[PDB]
Design a protein around this ligand. Structure first.
Ligand SMILES: O=C(O)COCc1ccccc1
Length: 171
């Protein structure tokens, strides 16, 4: 059976209970925590690519008021559907299963200034999603995998001082 497990789920949950935030910048910022998954039940003999995108979580934007996140407006038009290709792609099932798959180099931006960066809208909530794409497949069989534990609001600066502190503690 194909199984994709979130690594460091307890760490992600510490951020999620505060409401997680990720900085977006013109030139793009790496994530903390980093999304990492374990994988079993691929065909070790087959080749696959791992793609990461970010799904808009809500039909409204958010704002941090009196130390609480609350609905903050109607959403902006959706960011373009940017996909990050895991740099080990394409690779054998055996490669993906031998150790956890880390998306440590993906950068989140608020400027379409290129460079395999992911464009997000500030004060919108996103859910990371991984796709496993089988290589050489005339059916183009693909799996999708959502990580609710890893939901965050994109921000140009941290709103919650507890997030700023957690980011320093664990990073
Ligand atoms: O989904 C399965 O039963 C086989 O998993 C390997 C896989 C096949 C195609 C695309 C992604 C993963």
């Amino acid at each position: 059976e194909l199984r994709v497990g979130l690594e460091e789920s307890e760490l992600w949950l510490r951020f999620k209970e505060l409401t997680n935030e990720m900085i977006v910048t013109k030139n793009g910022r790496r994530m903390f925590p980093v999304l990492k998954v374990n994988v079993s039940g691929l065909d070790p003999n087959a080749m696959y690519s791992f793609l990461l995108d970010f799904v808009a979580a809500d039909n409204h934007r958010w704002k941090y008021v009196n130390g609480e996140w609350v609905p903050g407006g109607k959403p902006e038009p959706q960011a373009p559907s940017c996909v990050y290709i895991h740099p080990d792609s394409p690779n054998f099932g055996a490669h993906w299963m031998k150790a956890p798959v880390s998306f440590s180099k993906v950068k989140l931006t608020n400027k379409l200034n290129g460079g395999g960066q992911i464009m997000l809208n500030s004060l919108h909530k996103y859910e990371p999603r991984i796709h496993i794409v089988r290589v050489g497949d005339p059916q183009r069989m693909i799996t999708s995998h959502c990580f609710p534990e890893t939901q965050f609001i994109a921000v140009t600066a941290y709103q919650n001082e507890e997030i700023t502190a957690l980011k320093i503690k664990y990073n």
